[PDB]
Amino acid sequence: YDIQAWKKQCEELLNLIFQCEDSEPFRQPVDLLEYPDYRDIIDTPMDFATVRETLEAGNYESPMELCKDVRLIFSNSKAYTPSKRSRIYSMSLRLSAFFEEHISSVLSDYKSALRFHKR
Numbered sequence: 001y002d003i004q005a006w007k008k009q010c011e012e013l014l015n016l017i018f019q020c021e022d023s024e025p026f027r028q029p030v031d032l033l034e035y036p037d038y039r040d041i042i043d044t045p046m047d048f049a050t051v052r053e054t055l056e057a058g059n060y061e062s063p064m065e066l067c068k069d070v071r072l073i074f075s076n077s078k079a080y081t082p083s084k085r086s087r088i089y090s091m092s093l094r095l096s097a098f099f100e101e102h103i104s105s106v107l108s109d110y111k112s113a114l115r116f117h118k119r
């Protein structure tokens with residue numbers, strides 16, 4: 001029933017993601033000195049610190065918006081990887097599976113609470 005509960009649920013999930021070793025390449029914006037052509041390939045960079053800061057600033061209205069940005073981290077990894085077997089892309093696949101497994105109930109609970117609110 002709680003329309004606001006998603007926010008703390010997303011903070012807790014982001015805390016788990018930051019503890020997870022697989023998130024290391026995704027915690028901060030990609031450094032252009034390390035990957036000089038990054039912006040030639042990726043139009044909209046995204047990383048977990050930016051997601052956490054957007055959430056803490058009160059700049060997400062729903063968990064769907066946060067999901068869209070987290071999914072952008074993973075699609076940017078798939079777009080920039082030179083191979084489906086690269087280290088960083090393999091880490092992104094595992095982290096994405098972990099994220100999707102945990103975000104499902106957050107999204108479901110929010111959409112149910114909102115449908116109850118508008119009944």
Ligand SMILES: Cc1n[nH]cc1CNc1ccccc1F
Pocket residue numbers: 025026030035076077078080081082086087088089
């Ligand atoms: C993100 C990010 N973190 N660290 C480097 C990058 C750039 N992306 C990337 C690079 C190589 C293989 C696979 C990839 F997705």
